[PDB]
């Protein structure tokens, strides 16, 4: 019950839906730091029937689709399929997208994502981008830009 756990956590009054207040205060009470336009981007993406409310199916679907996207990004970065992402792979991937960066810049990115202080694996990746509403590698790169300060 991934998304059941999350939803049950967020739905404070237990009326079966999560409103924007519950999402905000919820994310803060779970310790996930998000800006209002990120949270609102999540909400607008999730509210398929546009009633200003997230029911369980909408929530579950958003997180499912998002997880698929992030998994796709991960597997697109992992060139040698070792289930991990090395800095050189970030360099190559960004190079195919017309960005030339150095090894220490990629290392900087990875360290911004890693906690083990090694390179990042699928668990850290997934956890890091779980509530980050980036939709693809481009948006991930833009996020890396305002996160690390490097202009990429
Ligand atoms: Ca509610
Ligand atoms: Ca809705
Ligand atoms: Ca790899
Ligand atoms: Ca690591």
Numbering used by the authors: 22 to 139, 141 to 174
Q: What's in the article?
A:
The mitochondrial ATP-Mg/Pi carrier (APC) is a member of the mitochondrial carrier family of transport proteins. APC is involved in the import of cytosolic adenine nucleotides into the mitochondrion and the export of inorganic phosphate from the mitochondrial matrix. Therefore, APC has the important role of altering the mitochondrial adenine nucleotide pool in order to adapt to changing cellular energetic demands. The N-terminal domain of APC forms a calcium-sensitive regulatory domain.
